[PDB]
Design a protein around this ligand. Structure first.
Ligand code: B12
Ligand SMILES: Cc1cn([C@H]2C[C@H](O)[C@@H](COP(=O)(O)OP(=O)(O)OP(=O)(O)O)O2)c(=O)[nH]c1=O
Ligand SMILES: Cc1cn([C@H]2C[C@H](O)[C@@H](COP(=O)(O)OP(=O)(O)OP(=O)(O)O)O2)c(=O)[nH]c1=O
Ligand SMILES: C[C@H]1O[C@@H](n2cnc3c(N)ncnc32)[C@H](O)[C@@H]1O
Ligand SMILES: [Cl-]
Ligand SMILES: [Co+2]
Ligand SMILES: [Mg+2]
Ligand SMILES: [Mg+2]
Lengths: 607, 611
C-alpha cells in the first residue's frame, strides 16, 4: 500500500502512557521558567519536521517562487512520517531541533509559514543546535593534543554527543619524555582524566592489540566508569585468525618508545575473553575490517567508533542517525516493500538535511561532516516484525529475511543518495573516494540476497552522483524505540513481560487471552516461554527472547545485517550465565570468520 | 664593604655536602642520554649568568659597538654574585636557563665570547625556556573556559610553573545550567578535574571567596585534591570583615549566575575554617581586597588569586619570576653591611628584570601580561641565621624593628633601581594607567615601621615618571634555594637546629660557631630529641634566647614578624604561623582576628601534631 495509506493507520495513534513518561521526562521542550512548550508527541514532530525541512533553503534545484511550496511540502511529509512514528531520528535531533529559534516559529500552523519565517529559522540556530549522536576525535601523543582532546570531549558531551577515540598514539607507560627527561604516564592513565572530565559534565576508548600497554588496558576496569572499552585490530581479520591458529606471537611496540615485547596472541585473546566473561568489557573493534569498506581509505582512515560501536569514524568526523520502525510495515504476512521504499527515500533526505541545519562545537568537525556527509539510516521494530511474521529469531529463516530486508533498504538508500547527489551536489570528497577511483567498489560484503546484482549496479551509478559517503547503520535505539512503542534496533526482545504489568503487544494478540492470564505468573518469573507447560510449541518457538537465542545465533544475525550495512552495527552477543571463557573465545574465533566489524558480549548475570 | 669584597669572602666557599646532593639530583643539567653537562655549582652560575646577561642585547641605551663589553660585564657581575650564593633566582631559572642552546656556548669562557655568540644564545632559547615560578590563570563560568584552564594547568605545569586560580566565577553546585536545563556541578567538583589533570603531568593554589554559596563545602574539601593548596578568598576590605565579625553579623552567600542564595553567621563560618585549619592546616586565608588596595593597576586589573605558596598576588594570566638575597652573608662585625647590600639589590633587580626578556612562556596571554606589567619578586633568605649572628631573639620587638628596617631598606633601593631601569630601558607599558601616575602619594605597601618612610615616599613620587616594574618584592619559601645557599629559609625561623632529611645530619652552622663545642657534643643528643634548646640544662641562657626555633616562638610573634615584613613588601609573603599542639580552635580564631588588624595579606597556620 502507499506510504500515505500506512500513515493514515498510524498518524492518529498516540504513544502509550509508557512512551509518554519518557517524552514528558526529557523530550518535550521546556522554557527557562521551566514550563512545558510541548505537551504532546505531535508538538515534537512539528518542531523537528520544520527545522529539518528548512535545509531545503540551500537546495539549488528550487526556483525562488516554488521555494516556499517545496519547503512546506517536506515539512508536512517529515511531519506526517514523524507523528505516525514510522521513522524517528536520533535523540539529539529530537532534543535540540530549533534551540535558539523563537518559540513563535517552531509550532505555529504551517499555513502561516512564510519564506521569511524559514529563512529566520535557519539564521537563528544557536551553538546548542547539535543534532548528531556520534563523534570521533584524535588524541595525539603530546600534553598539548591530549588536553585539547579532553576539552573537545567536554564540549561534545555538553551538546549531547557521544564521542570515542583510539588512544594508541599515546606512548606506553614508562617511555622516555624528552621535554622533562621523565617518563610517560601511558594511555590508560590519561584515560582517567577524560573520565574525570566527563564525570562533571557515553565514551568509547580503544587501544590497539599491539600497543605495549594492551594488557593493562584489558584489565583497566577492576575508575573508567564512563568508558566503554574495545581492543583495536587495525590489521586484517584474516591475519589475526591465522596467527591465532598457528599459536603465533604478536610483537608489542610503539613508534615513540623503545619498549617492545613478544606475547602469544592466544594468551592475549584469553585475557580479553576472561575480562569480558567477567564484566562485558572490553569488546573487539575490527578497524582493519572497517577501512576495507571505507570509501575514503587510505586518504582518510577509520581509527575508532562512537560509544555504541555502530559507526566507524575518521578523525573529527561525526554522524547523525535515524531508524525506521519496520514492525509497522507488516501487512498480511508480508513486508510492505512499496511503502517502505518510499519511506527510505524520505528518511535519507531527512537525515541528509539534518547535516545542513546542524551546529557542531568544533570547526574541524564541521569541516569533516561537510566533506563526507556520512549518514546512519537504520531500523527498529525488527524483533516484533518477526513476531508478526511468526519467524523464530534464532533460525536461518530469520537471518535470510533479515539480510533480504536490509538489502532492500541498502539498495534504495544508495539509490536515493544518487538522486540527492544529482539534485543538490555530490559530497566534496566523492572525487577521491573508491566510488570513483575503483571499479566494482561495494561499501559492504553482501552475499545473502537476490538483491546483490542490483546493488552492484547502483554503486556503479554513484560513481557520477553521490550525496553521501556512507548511509546505513543499526543503532541500539534504546530510547526512540520506546517512543515508537516497538522493539529495539535489531535485537530480540529481552523480555516478553514485566511489571503495572506489561506484556508484549504482539504476543498479546496471538496467544489465547485465557492462557496469557495463567502463564504470566510464571513468565515474568522465568523470563521465557520455553519451560512453561501447555503453551503451543510454535508460540514458544516464535516468541523467543534474547536469552533463548544462543550466542552463535546472535552473531549470525549480526553477520546477516552487516552484509548490507556500510557502517557498523550495535549488537550485544548475549550469553547464558553458564557460558565459560572458552565459549567466549569461540565467539571471538567465529566472529573473525564472519563479516561482523565489531564484537560485544555480555554473559547473563555476570555483573 | 664594597660588594666586590663581600664577593671574595664567599665566592670560594663550597656548597655543603648536602647542597651538592640537591644540585646533582635536580639542578646540574644533563644531555638526552642522562650524562652530566654540569658537575659543580660554578657551572650553573656560568650558564645562568650568561643566559640572563644576554637580555642586554635588547638594551636601547647601548650602542652596537659597546654591547659586547656591557654584556660581558653583566655576565661577570651576575656570575660572581651567583657563584658566591649571595643571590639565587627561583628554581625554574636554575633549571631551564640555556634550554635550546648549543652546549659549547653555555659554559664557554667569557673572554672568548663574541657579540654573535650572545645573539645565538638569545635565538636558540626553546619553548621549554621558562624561568618563572608563579602563574595565575582565570577559570571562567563556562565549560569552554574551564577546560581551556585545565589545558593551561597542564601546559604551565609541564614547563615547571606553579599555578593558582580563584574558582569563584563557577556557579554554585545545583545552579541552573541553560544549555541543558541540567544542574551545575560546582567549583569544588571542577577542581577535582584540575587535580586529575596534574596527577598525570610530572603544586596548585585553589581559592574560593568567603561569600560563595559553596564556601562551606570548599572549606571541608579535604577532610581528592592532593595537589591543591586551598585558601579562602576575602575580596572585601579586611576592615569590613573584622567589623562584621565583631558585630556578630551575617554574610550573604550569593552568586550572579545562580538563584542559590543563603545567609550565614560570619562567626560560624570563621569557626569552621579555624576548626579545619586546626585539624589539618588548611584552608589558609587570602586577603585579596588587601592585595588590591596596594595593586598599582587596580581596578583596571584585579588580583583574584595567588600562586601556590601565596607570596605573589597575580592578575589573570600574569606570571612572576623570583630571586632571593641571602642576608646572612651580609653580617659584618655586629652589623649588616648596608653598602654591599645596596649594590646587590641594584644588581638583583636588574637580573630579575632581565629574566623576563629571556623567558619563554607556553601561552601567549601570559607572555603579553608579563611584558605589560614586568612584575618582579625580589626577596630575602637567611633572615633567621642573620638574627643568630646578630644575637637577636626572633621572638622580640627588637627583631621585628630590625626586620622592618632591613626590608624598608631593600624596598627603597629596589624601587630606586626600578626608576633607574625605567629611565635606561623603558617604563613598563602600563605605568601610564597605574596609580604611580594617576594618584598622588601612592605607596604599594603600608610602611609605618621605619625611618626610611619619607625616603621611600620620595622615590615613589619619582617613579611617576620612570618605572621599569609594577612591583618588585616578595618573601618566598625558598625551600630549595636556601638549601643550595646553606642558609635559613626566607623570613622563617629555623624549624630545627639539628635534624635529618631524606640522608642525614643538618646542624645549624651559627649554633656550631657560638655554642661551646664541648657543650655541643653534650647536648647534641638531647637537642635532636627535644627539637629545641628551651629546657636543656647546662646551656647558657644567652644561647637559649637567641637560638630559638619555630615552635619556641609563640603564634603572635610569628604573626607580628610577618606584619613587620609585609609593611615593606609590595607583593605578599609566605609565612607559616606555627602553633603548639596544645593550641585550641579559639587560639586559631584569635590569630585570624589579629591578622585582620595587622598588615598581613594572607595567613597560613599549622598546629604541631595536626597531621
Ligand atoms: C614549600 C613548602 C610547601 C609546599 C611544597 C610544594 C612546593 N611548592 O615546594 C606546599 C605549599 C605544598 C606546602 C604545604 C604544607 N606544608 Co609545607 N613546606 C614547604 C617548605 C617551606 C619548603 C621545603 C622544601 O622545599 N624543602 C626542600 C626539599 C628538597 O626537601 P624535601 O623534604 O624533599 O621537600 C618536600 C617535603 O618537605 C614536602 N612538604 C611540604 N610541606 C610539608 C610538610 C610536612 C609536615 C612534611 C613531612 C613534608 C612537607 O614538600 C617537599 C617537596 O615539594 C618547608 C619549610 C622549609 N623547610 O623551608 C615546609 C614545611 C615542611 N611545611 C610544613 C607544613 C606544616 C605544611 C602544611 C601542612 C601547612 C599548611 N598550613 O598548609 C601544608 C600541607 C602539606 C603537608 N604539610 O603535607 C611545615 C612542617 C611542620 C612539621 N612539624 O612537620 C614546614 C616545616 C613549614 C613551616 N614553616 O612550618 N609546603
Ligand atoms: C610532559 C609529559 C608528557 N607525558 C606524556 C604525554 C604524551 O603521551 C607524551 C609526549 O608528551 P609531550 O608533551 O609531547 O612531551 P615533549 O614534547 O616535551 O617530549 P617528547 O618530544 O619526547 O614527546 O608523554 C607524560 O606522561 N608526563 C609528562 O609530564
Ligand atoms: C553544560 C554544563 C555546565 N556546567 C556548569 C559549568 C559552569 O560552571 C556553568 C556554565 O556552563 P556553560 O558551558 O556556560 O553552560 P551553558 O552556557 O549552556 O549554560 P549557561 O548559558 O546558563 O551558562 O555550568 C556543568 O556543571 N555541567 C554541564 O553539563
Ligand atoms: C609551607 C609553605 O606552604 C605554603 N602554603 C600552604 N598552604 C598555603 C596556602 N593555603 N596559602 C598560601 N601558602 C600556603 C606556605 O606559604 C608555606 O610557605
Ligand atoms: Cl571459564
Ligand atoms: Co545496557
Ligand atoms: Mg612531544
Ligand atoms: Mg555559557
Amino acid at each position: 500500500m502507499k506510504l500515505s495509506d500506512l500513515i493514515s493507520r498510524w498518524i492518529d495513534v498516540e504513544p502509550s502512557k509508557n512512551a509518554q513518561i519518557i517524552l514528558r521526562d526529557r523530550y518535550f521542550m521546556k522554557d527557562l521558567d521551566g514550563n512545558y512548550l510541548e505537551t504532546k508527541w505531535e508538538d515534537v514532530a512539528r518542531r523537528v519536521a520544520r527545522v529539518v525541512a528548512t535545509a531545503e533553503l540551500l537546495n539549488p534545484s528550487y526556483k525562488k517562487n516554488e521555494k516556499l511550496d517545496r519547503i512546506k511540502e517536506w515539512e508536512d511529509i517529515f511531519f506526517r512520517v514523524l507523528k505516525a512514528r514510522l521513522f524517528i531520528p536520533n535523540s539529539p535531533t529530537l532534543f535540540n531541533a530549533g534551540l535558539g529559534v523563537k518559540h513563535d516559529l517552531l509550532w505555529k500552523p504551517i499555513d502561516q509559514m512564510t519564506l521569511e519565517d524559514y529563512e529566520e529559522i535557519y539564521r537563528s540556530r544557536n551553538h546548542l543546535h547539535m543534532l548528531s549522536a556520534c563523534f570521533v576525535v584524535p588524541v595525539g601523543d603530546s600534553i598539548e593534543e591530549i588536553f585539547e582532546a579532553v576539552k573537545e570531549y567536554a564540549l561534545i558531551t555538553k551538546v549531547g554527543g557521544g564521542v570515542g577515540s583510539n588512544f594508541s598514539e599515546l606512548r606506553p607507560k614508562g617511555s622516555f619524555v624528552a621535554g622533562t627527561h621523565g617518563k610517560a604516564s601511558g594511555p590508560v592513565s590519561f584515560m582517567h582524566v577524560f573520565n574525570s572530565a566527563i564525570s562533571v559534565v557515553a565514551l568509547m576508548g580503544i587501544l590497539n592489540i599491539n600497543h605495549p600497554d594492551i594488557e593493562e588496558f584489558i584489565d583497566a576496569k577492576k575508575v573508567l566508569n564512563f568508558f566503554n572499552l574495545s581492543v583495536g585490530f587495525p590489521m586484517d581479520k584474516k591475519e589475526i585468525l591465522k596467527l591465532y591458529e598457528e599459536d603465533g606471537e604478536l610483537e608489542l611496540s610503539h613508534p615513540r618508545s623503545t619498549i617492545r615485547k613478544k606475547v602469544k596472541i592466544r594468551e592475549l585473546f584469553r585475557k580479553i575473553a576472561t575480562n569480558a566473561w567477567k564484566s562485558g568489557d572490553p569488546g573487539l573493534a575490527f578497524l582493519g575490517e572497517m577501512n576495507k569498506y571505507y570509501p575514503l581509505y587510505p586518504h582518510r582512515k577509520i581509527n575508532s567508533t562512537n560509544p555504541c560501536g555502530e559507526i566507524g569514524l575518521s578523525d573529527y568526523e561525526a554522524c547523525n542517525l535515524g531508524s525506521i520502525d519496520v514492525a509497522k510495515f507488516y501487512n498480511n504476512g508480508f513486508v510492505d516493500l512499496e511503502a517502505l521504499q518510499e519511506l527510505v527515500q524520505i528518511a535519507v533526505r531527512f537525515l541528509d538535511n539534518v547535516i545542513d541545519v546542524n551546529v557542531f562545537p568544533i570547526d574541524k568537525i564541521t569541516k569533516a561532516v561537510k566533506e563526507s556527509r556520512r549518514l546512519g539510516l537504520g531500523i527498529m521494530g525488527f524483533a516484533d516484525l518477526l513476531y508478526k511474521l511468526e519467524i523464530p529469531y534464532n533460525s536461518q529463516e530469520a537471518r535470510d529475511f533479515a539480510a533480504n530486508l536490509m538489502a532492500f533498504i541498502a539498495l534504495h538508500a544508495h539509490r536515493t543518495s544518487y538522486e540527492l547527489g544529482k539534485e543538490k551536489g555530490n559530497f566534496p570528497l566523492l572525487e577521491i573516494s573508491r566510488y570513483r577511483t575503483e571499479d566494482n567498489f561495494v561499501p559492504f560484503a553482501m552475499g545473502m540476497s537476490n538483491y546483490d546484482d542490483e546493488i552492484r549496479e547502483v554503486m556503479k551509478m554513484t560513481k557520477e552522483f553521490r550525496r553521501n559517503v556512507a548511509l546505513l547503520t543499526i543503532a541500539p535505539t534504546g530510547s526512540i524505540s520506546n517512543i515508537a512503542d516497538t522493539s529495539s534496533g535489531l535485537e530480540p526482545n529481552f523480555l516478553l513481560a514485566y511489571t503495572l504489568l506489561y506484556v508484549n503487544q504482539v504476543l498479546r494478540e496471538k496467544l489465547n487471552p485465557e492462557i496469557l492470564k495463567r502463564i504470566e505468573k510464571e513468565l515474568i518469573e522465568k523470563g521465557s516461554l520455553k519451560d512453561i507447560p501447555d503453551v503451543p510449541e510454535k508460540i514458544k518457538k516464535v516468541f523467543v527472547v534474547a536469552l533463548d537465542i544462543d550466542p552463535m545465533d546472535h552473531l549470525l544475525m549480526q553477520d546477516a545485517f552487516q552484509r548490507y550495512v556500510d557502517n557498523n552495527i550495535s549488537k550485544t552477543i548475549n550469553m547464558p550465565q553458564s557460558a565459560t571463557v572458552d565459549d567466549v573465545l569461540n565467539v571471538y574465533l567465529e566472529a573473525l570468520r564472519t563479516n561482523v566489524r565489531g564484537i560485544t558480549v555480555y554473559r547473563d548475570g555476570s555483573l
